[PDB]
Amino acid sequence: GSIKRFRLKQRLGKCRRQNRPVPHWYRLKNTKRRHWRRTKLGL
Template sequence: SDPRVSSRRRRRSFLPAVTMPSHKTFRIKQKLAKKQRQNRPIPYWIRMRTDNTIRYNAKRRHWRRTKLGF
């Protein structure tokens, strides 16, 4: 019913079936590993240290919604 959701679904269907090769170069593998390490919630002690002004990781990325672009 919502036009934004339906257009998002339509756009996703046009993505190629195979976007990630199984044979990665070492450079790409390093970049993926770094992005995987960055993609985590903030530690609880940081919330305590900043008096809860930083509550969540603003740069959190979902594997299906946001692609890395390399």
């Protein structure tokens, strides 16, 4: 919707933040990854 409650909005942001792929320099020293369309957050 247009509207949200603040906890819900913050959580949606948290999930979005969680998605972000593994940092490229780290690999020089993933398996779990939300994709929006076919894999709903549900919460």
